[PDB]
Amino acid sequence: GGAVMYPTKETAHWKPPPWNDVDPPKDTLVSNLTLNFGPQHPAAHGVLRLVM
Amino acid sequence: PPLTLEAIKDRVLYVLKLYDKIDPEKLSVNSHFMKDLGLDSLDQVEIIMAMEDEFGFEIPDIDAEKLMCPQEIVDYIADKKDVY
Amino acid sequence: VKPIFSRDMNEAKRRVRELYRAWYREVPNTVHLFQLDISVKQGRDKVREMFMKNAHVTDPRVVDLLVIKGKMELEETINVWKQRTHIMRFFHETEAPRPTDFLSKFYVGHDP
Amino acid sequence: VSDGSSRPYRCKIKAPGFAHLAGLDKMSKGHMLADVVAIIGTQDIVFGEVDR
Amino acid sequence: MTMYIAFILSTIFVIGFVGFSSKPSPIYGGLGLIVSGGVGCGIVLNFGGSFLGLMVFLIYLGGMLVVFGYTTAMATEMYPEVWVSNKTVFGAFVSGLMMEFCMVYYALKEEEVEIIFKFNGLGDWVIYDTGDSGFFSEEAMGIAALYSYGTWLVIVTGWSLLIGVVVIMEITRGN
Amino acid sequence: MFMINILSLIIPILLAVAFLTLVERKVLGYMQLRKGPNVVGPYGLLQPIADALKLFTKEPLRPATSSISMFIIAPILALSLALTMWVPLPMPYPLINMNLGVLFMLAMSSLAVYSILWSGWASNSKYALIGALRAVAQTISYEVTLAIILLSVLLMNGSYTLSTLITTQEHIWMIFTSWPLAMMWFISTLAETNRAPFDLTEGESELVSGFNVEYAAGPFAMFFMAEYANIIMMNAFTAILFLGASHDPHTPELYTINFVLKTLALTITFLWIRASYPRFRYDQLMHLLWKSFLPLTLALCMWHISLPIMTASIPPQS
Amino acid sequence: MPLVYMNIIMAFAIALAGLLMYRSHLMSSLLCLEGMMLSLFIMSTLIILNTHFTLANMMPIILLVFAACEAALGLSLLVMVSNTYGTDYVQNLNLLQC
Amino acid sequence: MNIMLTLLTNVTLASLLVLIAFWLPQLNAYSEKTSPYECGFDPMGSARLPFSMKFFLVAITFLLFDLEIALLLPLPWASQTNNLKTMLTMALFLLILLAASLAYEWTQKGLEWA
Amino acid sequence: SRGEYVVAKLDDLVNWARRSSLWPMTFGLACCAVEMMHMAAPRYDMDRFGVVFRASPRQSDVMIVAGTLTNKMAPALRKVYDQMPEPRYVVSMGSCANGGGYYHYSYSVVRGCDRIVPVDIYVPGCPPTAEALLYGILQLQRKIKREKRLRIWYRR
Numbered sequence A: 001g002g003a004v005m006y007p008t009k010e011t012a013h014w015k016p017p018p019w020n021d022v023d024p025p026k027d028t029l030v031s032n033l034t035l036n037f038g039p040q041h042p043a044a045h046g047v048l049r050l051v052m
Numbered sequence B: 001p002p003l004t005l006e007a008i009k010d011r012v013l014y015v016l017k018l019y020d021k022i023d024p025e026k027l028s029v030n031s032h033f034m035k036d037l038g039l040d041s042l043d044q045v046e047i048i049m050a051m052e053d054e055f056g057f058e059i060p061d062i063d064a065e066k067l068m069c070p071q072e073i074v075d076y077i078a079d080k081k082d083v084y
Numbered sequence C: 001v002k003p004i005f006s007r008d009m010n011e012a013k014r015r016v017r018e019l020y021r022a023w024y025r026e027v028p029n030t031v032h033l034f035q036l037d038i039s040v041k042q043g044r045d046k047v048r049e050m051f052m053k054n055a056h057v058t059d060p061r062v063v064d065l066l067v068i069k070g071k072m073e074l075e076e077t078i079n080v081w082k083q084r085t086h087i088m089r090f091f092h093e094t095e096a097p098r099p100t101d102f103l104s105k106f107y108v109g110h111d112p
Numbered sequence D: 001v002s003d004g005s006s007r008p009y010r011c012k013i014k015a016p017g018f019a020h021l022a023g024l025d026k027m028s029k030g031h032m033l034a035d036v037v038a039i040i041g042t043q044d045i046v047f048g049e050v051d052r
Numbered sequence E: 001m002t003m004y005i006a007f008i009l010s011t012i013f014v015i016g017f018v019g020f021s022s023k024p025s026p027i028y029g030g031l032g033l034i035v036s037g038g039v040g041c042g043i044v045l046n047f048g049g050s051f052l053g054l055m056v057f058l059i060y061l062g063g064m065l066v067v068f069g070y071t072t073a074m075a076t077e078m079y080p081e082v083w084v085s086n087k088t089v090f091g092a093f094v095s096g097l098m099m100e101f102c103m104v105y106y107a108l109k110e111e112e113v114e115i116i117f118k119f120n121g122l123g124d125w126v127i128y129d130t131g132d133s134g135f136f137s138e139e140a141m142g143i144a145a146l147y148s149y150g151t152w153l154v155i156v157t158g159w160s161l162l163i164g165v166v167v168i169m170e171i172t173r174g175n
Numbered sequence F: 001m002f003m004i005n006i007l008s009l010i011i012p013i014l015l016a017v018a019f020l021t022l023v024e025r026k027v028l029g030y031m032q033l034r035k036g037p038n039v040v041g042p043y044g045l046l047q048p049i050a051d052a053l054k055l056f057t058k059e060p061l062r063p064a065t066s067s068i069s070m071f072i073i074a075p076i077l078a079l080s081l082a083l084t085m086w087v088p089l090p091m092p093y094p095l096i097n098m099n100l101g102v103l104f105m106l107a108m109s110s111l112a113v114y115s116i117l118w119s120g121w122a123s124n125s126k127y128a129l130i131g132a133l134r135a136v137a138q139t140i141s142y143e144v145t146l147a148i149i150l151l152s153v154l155l156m157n158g159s160y161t162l163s164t165l166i167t168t169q170e171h172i173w174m175i176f177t178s179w180p181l182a183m184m185w186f187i188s189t190l191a192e193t194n195r196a197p198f199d200l201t202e203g204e205s206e207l208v209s210g211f212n213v214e215y216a217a218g219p220f221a222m223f224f225m226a227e228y229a230n231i232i233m234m235n236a237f238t239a240i241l242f243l244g245a246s247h248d249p250h251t252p253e254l255y256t257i258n259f260v261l262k263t264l265a266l267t268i269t270f271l272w273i274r275a276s277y278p279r280f281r282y283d284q285l286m287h288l289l290w291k292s293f294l295p296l297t298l299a300l301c302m303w304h305i306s307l308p309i310m311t312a313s314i315p316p317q318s
Numbered sequence G: 001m002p003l004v005y006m007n008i009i010m011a012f013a014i015a016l017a018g019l020l021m022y023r024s025h026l027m028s029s030l031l032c033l034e035g036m037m038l039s040l041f042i043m044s045t046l047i048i049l050n051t052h053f054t055l056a057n058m059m060p061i062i063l064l065v066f067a068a069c070e071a072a073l074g075l076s077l078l079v080m081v082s083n084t085y086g087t088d089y090v091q092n093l094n095l096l097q098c
Numbered sequence H: 001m002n003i004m005l006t007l008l009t010n011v012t013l014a015s016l017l018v019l020i021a022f023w024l025p026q027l028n029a030y031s032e033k034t035s036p037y038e039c040g041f042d043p044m045g046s047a048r049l050p051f052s053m054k055f056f057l058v059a060i061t062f063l064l065f066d067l068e069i070a071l072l073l074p075l076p077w078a079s080q081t082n083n084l085k086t087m088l089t090m091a092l093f094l095l096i097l098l099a100a101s102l103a104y105e106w107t108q109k110g111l112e113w114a
Numbered sequence I: 001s002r003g004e005y006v007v008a009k010l011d012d013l014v015n016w017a018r019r020s021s022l023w024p025m026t027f028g029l030a031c032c033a034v035e036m037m038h039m040a041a042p043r044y045d046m047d048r049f050g051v052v053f054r055a056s057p058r059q060s061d062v063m064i065v066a067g068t069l070t071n072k073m074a075p076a077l078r079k080v081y082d083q084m085p086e087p088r089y090v091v092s093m094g095s096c097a098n099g100g101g102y103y104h105y106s107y108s109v110v111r112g113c114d115r116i117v118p119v120d121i122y123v124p125g126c127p128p129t130a131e132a133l134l135y136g137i138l139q140l141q142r143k144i145k146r147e148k149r150l151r152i153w154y155r156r
């Protein structure tokens, strides 16, 4: 029932493959770019620091 | 790689030694921080943060205050890491 | 009296310790991001000094409100809402030392 | 609010731009940066009113 | 010196390959690929292949555009690497340049170098033919025979491209 | 004397770019109820020279986060490519007569795009990166339709040699034959030159300055010169391709005058469009080109392939 | 064989070595694949032009067409890999073993 | 060689202009002047972090269509053959396959973004 | 001396180029910005004089501080001024920018933009009329015309 027969010490720790699918490793993989739209921006009316 | 209790004690003592406020000479496993070493509550919080960094497991607030003895830190670490 | 977040002083102390942990871990990231020339030890000492300034508080609600303000400041620092000027304002570098002995105050000016 | 003196006790200015800029985030959902510029234009915000 | 324009360009080609093969950040590897594509166009034009060379340059110029965008999106790094930012990349670059310089000088000096095949140091001008193509561009006439002679190649390539669009759509569905 | 010819092509083109800046400023001002620059020189003639001197006597700043090598290389590439593309053009006789001049111009235009992308990436600023990505999207939108339109029109020419366009349009302008392709081509040239309503890369209103936000003094002047030179060169290409001119071999000056006037008119149209219309969203630009221009271009390319065959009008290869 | 053939075959060898020696990113190895395709185009074009194999001057263009097909496939796979792992690093293609 | 000379001349002019721009002017470079531009306030993160491309599929399809652009450019010389029937059939076959690919991607919501 | 004459003429050329082409940055804080736009409007079009508004600080030569400068905005203004390449000139428009004006005694107002950035020309008024701002810009141009950088270099 192991992942590999005749397992070694390192492989023994390794878990067997998932039955259906691998778990999603979603962990802060996408970091949205943060932009200071203003104040100096022409479209910010000069005094708006829109953090987007 | 058996995570021996004495290795845990060595790591805790090393972390405590690195902290400047603790004087190296009077540091002991049974030396309670507040009275034996004279460090304050925020000092104890900082030492707990150092320990959690060294062992990689986060110590919650309730458990951390139950500390103030290096031996207590060692035993709590053993309990979390299932030593003996 | 209605509690803001804590019904007793011990709970407020727990919240204060949590905030102190957050600042203590954030300090090196602040030095890196804001390109501050202070050392990490210096910033953490400033954090302790700011915490110690209000160490005399004995009312749970005041402590809770102070923790709220500290959390807001920490959010500002974690983001880049505060600039290097705001972060370095805690260190009053430009301001000259003000003598506190009676004779120096007497010499310098009429201020009590 | 007047205290009967020659100087107002309290004067609170309700600026229409305040609530519109507050709702800017809700309006911007699902749009791009140029759409955000257009939405800032639509609500006609003069930040003297907003900041007072 | 103009007697060996081809050799100089080929050496530049090999240097560009040693650039994008040492694997700097995809941006500078794309720079290398663009330079190598331009130099290859130069070589093919010197041999009489103006259309082919220009086509390679045009296609790789567009291809490296999508590569650049993809890099800034997926193959991105906080400190992108240049050929002097890591000992491995610079090691690869220096080794590639040295290997070129080695074979280059070896073949130029020695009459007949033989690395894996036998190469003669005589300039490329020797091999060129003395015939005349008249009122024709042989490359153009051959490339135009894809529609008159290569109906089978047209069928295969068109199907391959349509199935490629389908394949990309399926591979990027992502369920 | 070929070096003299190269200088004759280069130097006058740069002066033309300089005075194009004045023309644009005045034309936009008059279309806006204003007077363009007039104080500096008679009728504003010396304004360009003052701008060039100011820019080249202004401190150039190298951004701390920038990659200096690409940061410097990009303006050089932009200006050199902008000057290079002028070489193959027949006015009436080309400086370099190539059998495949049109493909050369297409490849060179493709190469110039990397100047914008390299500048934006090297700047290491978020706005510059956004501008570079917009330039990537713009090329993706326009390149295919540009190539297909050029192929469809050149099918009547019978070659990619620019010079032979004059002979093909000896009796009539090709716009009469291919006016729809001409419209799509003009819009595509607007897109390629990053001109309004497709001025997305710079996009001052939306991006403070786009790719050149971190460029100052000489490098910015070089980017501006490349932009205007590309405008003029693309309009000249349109004039050659569609609005053909009479060429008397004994007197080339007549053809040169006609060609210059047509190119001036097309550049003035460029400024006119910049004044009139608002700016597109880059998603909208890509959608316009792919969903609207591309299918019509495919259909018209089929039509132009068939028409010489069904009308027995296949052009001579030579 | 003239030396230009030597240089172009050397370029192919270098690109092959680059592809077979990955470092971290997948994009770089796809670029090495494209470099190999460019080297093959140059070699084929030189041979076909020197030998005046007129009906073989189209083979480089078909080679380029299928090279671009391969490039598209590579990028479409890289996008999925990046989505599933957050980077294009080859070390993440480690679930399947042996 | 004329093309090489022209390219060299243009590149040398551009490089000379860059040199004159970086050496004629006076400079007072200090850290704050060379810092990145973020509309007055300081940047939060880097500009070298990943920037999601919402039009990736269109870019790959652009590569695949540039291939067809390459395949269609020989058409002007192809019209000079004697088998104009087969040439026309194959040219229309290629253009109809490109149209089919565009239609497939469009109908499958591939030309849309995100 | 011939060297002095050459230096004087080259300085004349440089000053003429710099004053003729003055590119203000698109920086407007408060009501005074509107009068600035009216200056850009057809009646007093500043483009005639060579003054063209350019957004990027690195592509601009003059900063016009139109409107009140709050303590919150001051660091951004200093950053924009620093990022602006030199030669750079600052014009303070309106009482609020000049010395704080109506909000001088406010906690959130910097009592003058001179405290944060060096100012070359002060345009009085609240709001200063567009003609007043144009007069200030022309005064700055004359100030540039009076500059003697190369002459001082030769004499030093």
Ligand code: SF4
Pocket: I030, I031, I032, I033, I066, I067, I068, I094, I095, I096, I097, I101, I102, I125, I126, I127, I128
């Ligand atoms: S000076 Fe007057 S017009 Fe100008 S911003 Fe202040 S209050 Fe408004």
